[PDB]
């Protein structure tokens, strides 16, 4: 054997074991989710409070690309930042040449091709993150989830990290119970609940909730962080549902 020692090497199955090993690093990371709604998308993430010494609200994990795209990820945090830095360069060159802001599907492939490129050579390591991202463009709302292999699809709801199965189950119920659609303000509240429910799989350390959103009506198509009264309202909604 030895097929798992080098990246870009096919095993006799037809698998790239190094990519599957990168997925294990993603599974080890904290929970993050994405919820598509009527006219936009909502992102949320679990931030483990390792210590009392961590400054609240000042270790931001959700990142913005351009002005209309939000990105969140689980796994190796530096790898996620490197991917967003590339995403920002890709979005900047698109807008530079074509004037219009980068569409979400266009943006999704730019990340996809870049991540996929890191499975082609043994001189690079695959990305140790699954990235949930999306936003609002001319064709409406789009949510995506990208994996270490470069594989991505569009999603109604997306989840990754240590509590992905719990979050997926909760997401599937929302899709069934709301066939006509979920509103942006509802999706923020539901996102909070799902992170709190998904925290049961990481319950040694208590956590800090962080939410962001893009919505055509509520945020005017731009990416914003949920803060203050709207954040606390979503936390209270989540607290009421666990009890």
């Amino acid at each position: 054997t030895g097929y798992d020692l080098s990246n870009s090497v096919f095993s006799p199955d037809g698998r790239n074991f190094q990519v599957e090993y990168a997925v294990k690093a993603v599974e080890n990371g904290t929970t993050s989710i994405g919820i598509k709604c009527n006219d936009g998308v909502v992102f949320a993430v679990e931030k483990l409070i390792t210590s009392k010494l961590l400054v609240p609200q000042k270790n931001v994990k959700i990142q913005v690309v351009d002005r209309h795209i939000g990105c969140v990820y689980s796994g190796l945090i530096p790898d996620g930042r490197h991917l967003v830095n590339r995403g920002r360069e890709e979005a900047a060159s698109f807008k530079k040449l074509y004037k219009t802001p980068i569409p979400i599907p266009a943006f999704a492939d730019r990340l996809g091709q870049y991540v996929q490129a890191h499975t082609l050579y043994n001189s690079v390591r695959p990305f140790g993150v699954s990235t949930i991202f999306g936003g609002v463009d001319k064709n409406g709302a789009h949510l995506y989830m990208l994996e270490p292999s470069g594989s991505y699809w569009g999603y109604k709801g997306a989840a990754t990290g240590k509590g992905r199965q719990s979050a997926k189950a909760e997401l599937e119920k929302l899709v069934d119970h709301h066939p006509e659609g979920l509103s942006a303000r509802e999706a923020v509240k539901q996102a909070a609940k799902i992170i709190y429910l998904a925290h049961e799989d990481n319950k040694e350390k208590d956590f800090e909730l962080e939410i962001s959103w893009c919505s055509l009506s509520e945020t005017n198509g731009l990416h914003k962080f949920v803060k203050g009264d709207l954040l606390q309202e979503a936390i209270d909604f989540a607290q009421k549902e666990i009890n």
Partner: protein, 244 residues
């Protein structure tokens, strides 16, 4: 990364030998024998073709003996494809010298440069060496008739008579026995063929399994002529010495 798959072609053994050079020499020892003999009035090059097939086109073929310029030729032992890379380089080097100085290149200078190229492949670059040994036969106005050999190590030496390729041990003993300094070309021709005829792995030495060449001053007055022997001319010289 790629380190895993690197053979490390340019390293020393614990004994102080170059693995790849030694193994390239082992490759060359299975190649058809080539003999060079230097006489007072010319040089002979003789070489044995590698196990010939009856349907091989013999007259329009070149495997062992190559022309570098009008005054210098080489006999090859090893990979032909590798030898041709080096030959074209040597041909170009000779023309660069002629273009620069308006004089034909001295034999040793050409040999040294070709040998320096081979040396480079043993010290840097991480590539395999050229699996080739040359016998250089040539003339210039400084040293007259000269025989050299070079091998994959890039080391070269001068000779009165020499063999490369297969059965060099046996061939060198036979040359060392019958060679003498006042020898003529026609005698050297006979010695070359007699040596191949005894050291050959074939049943009997025939015209179709030989390449032959001479470098004489047998042209008209103070000038050198290269003669790459035709099939019929090898057939006649083989009968004339009484081998067939």
């Amino acid at each position: 990364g790629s380190r895993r798959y690197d053979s490390r072609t340019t390293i020393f053994s614990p004994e102080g030998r170059l693995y790849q050079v030694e193994y390239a020499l082992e490759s060359i020892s299975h190649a058809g024998t080539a003999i060079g003999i230097m006489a007072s009035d010319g040089i002979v090059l003789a070489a044995e073709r590698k196990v010939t097939s009856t349907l091989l086109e013999q007259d329009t073929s070149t495997e062992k003996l190559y022309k570098l310029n009008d005054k210098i030729a080489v006999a090859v032992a090893g990979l032909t494809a590798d030898a041709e890379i080096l030959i074209n380089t040597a041909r170009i080097h000779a023309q660069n010298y002629l273009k620069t100085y308006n004089e034909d290149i001295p034999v040793e200078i050409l040999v040294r440069r070709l040998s320096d190229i081979k040396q480079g492949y043993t010290q840097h670059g991480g590539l395999r060496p050229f699996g080739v040994s040359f016998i250089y036969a040539g003339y210039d106005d400084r040293y007259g008739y000269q025989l050299y050999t070079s091998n994959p190590s890039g080391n070269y030496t001068g000779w009165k008579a020499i063999s490369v390729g297969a059965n060099t041990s046996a061939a060198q003993t036979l040359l060392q026995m019958d060679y003498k300094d006042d020898m003529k070309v026609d005698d050297a021709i006979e010695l070359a063929l007699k040596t191949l005829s005894k050291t050959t792995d074939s049943s009997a030495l025939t015209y179709d399994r030989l390449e032959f060449a001479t470098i004489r001053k047998g042209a008209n007055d103070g000038e050198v002529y290269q003669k790459i022997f035709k099939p019929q001319e090898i057939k006649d010289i083989l009968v004339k010495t009484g081998i067939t």
